Amino acid sequence: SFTMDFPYDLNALFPERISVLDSTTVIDELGKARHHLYLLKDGEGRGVIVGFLKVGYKKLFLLDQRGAHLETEPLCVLDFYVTETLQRHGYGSELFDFMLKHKQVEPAQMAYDRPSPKFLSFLEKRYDLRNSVPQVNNFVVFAGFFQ
Ligand SMILES: CC(=O)SCCNC(=O)CCNC(=O)[C@H](O)C(C)(C)COP(=O)(O)OP(=O)(O)OC[C@H]1O[C@@H](n2cnc3c(N)ncnc32)[C@H](O)[C@@H]1OP(=O)(O)O
């Protein structure tokens, strides 16, 4: 058994629509705002869930470095969040490094679904992913993806 608290924001942006019922009333609604989801908690001292990371495979139609079309099905980062007040504490790096270690895969080999400015900075500074191959499908892949 274990305890689980969701900050307001992480609770709403949860990448899974979940209704929790009590034998019949509802305890919590998450998500109002081939796959693997990673969650992370901290003793603080009364516990709390601080981040989540969802990755999964997805068939993608991409352009290569010279515009040639091509299909591929890489592991993709689909959702990635750390409750706001606790960003830049290292939690993001924790979740991400675990995922890589166990999925046994490198950042440059992944596609990134609609990364935000914070996530881009995170990828660029922490994993030196800087050179992106332009897409038109809202996924971001870097040069290593094709090498
Ligand atoms: C595919 C999808 O999931 S789309 C992307 C999702 N992004 C969002 O929803 C917005 C923000 N939410 C977040 O949870 C975080 O900002 C994440 C997921 C990007 C990173 O998690 P954090 O725990 O905050 O990152 P962590 O503390 O592990 O590493 C720090 C690095 O992240 C980046 N970072 C985190 N917050 C910021 C910020 N406000 N401005 C700029 N860079 C930031 C920087 O590269 C920073 O490096 P520095 O501290 O050396 O400058």
Curated annotation (Swiss-Prot):
Where in or outside the cell it occurs: the entry states: Cytoplasm; Membrane, Clathrin-coated pit; Cell junction, Focal adhesion; Cell projection, Axon
Q: What is the effect of changing residue 116 to A?
A: Reduces activity to 8%
Q: What follows loss of this gene?
A: Morpholino knockdown of the protein causes developmental defects at 48 hours post-fertilization (hpf), including cilia curved body shape, short body axis, hydrocephalus, small head and small eyes. Morphants often do not respond, or have slow startle response, when probed with a needle, consistent with neuromuscular defects.
Please state every residue range assigned to the domain named N-acetyltransferase. 4-146
Top-level taxon of the source organism = Eukaryota
Q: List positions binding acetyl-CoA.
A: 80-93, 116-125
How is this protein organized at the quaternary level? Monomer.
Family, according to the entry, reads as follows: Belongs to the acetyltransferase ATAT1 family.
* Primary role: Specifically acetylates 'Lys-40' in alpha-tubulin on the lumenal side of microtubules. Promotes microtubule destabilization and accelerates microtubule dynamics; this activity may be independent of acetylation activity. Acetylates alpha-tubulin with a slow enzymatic rate, due to a catalytic site that is not optimized for acetyl transfer. Enters the microtubule through each end and diffuses quickly throughout the lumen of microtubules.
> Protein name, please?
Alpha-tubulin N-acetyltransferase 1
State the organism named in the record.
Danio rerio (Zebrafish)
Phylogenetic classification of the source organism: Eukaryota, Metazoa, Chordata, Craniata, Vertebrata
Annotated gene: atat1
Please give the range of the full-length protein represented by this chain: 1 to 185 of 297
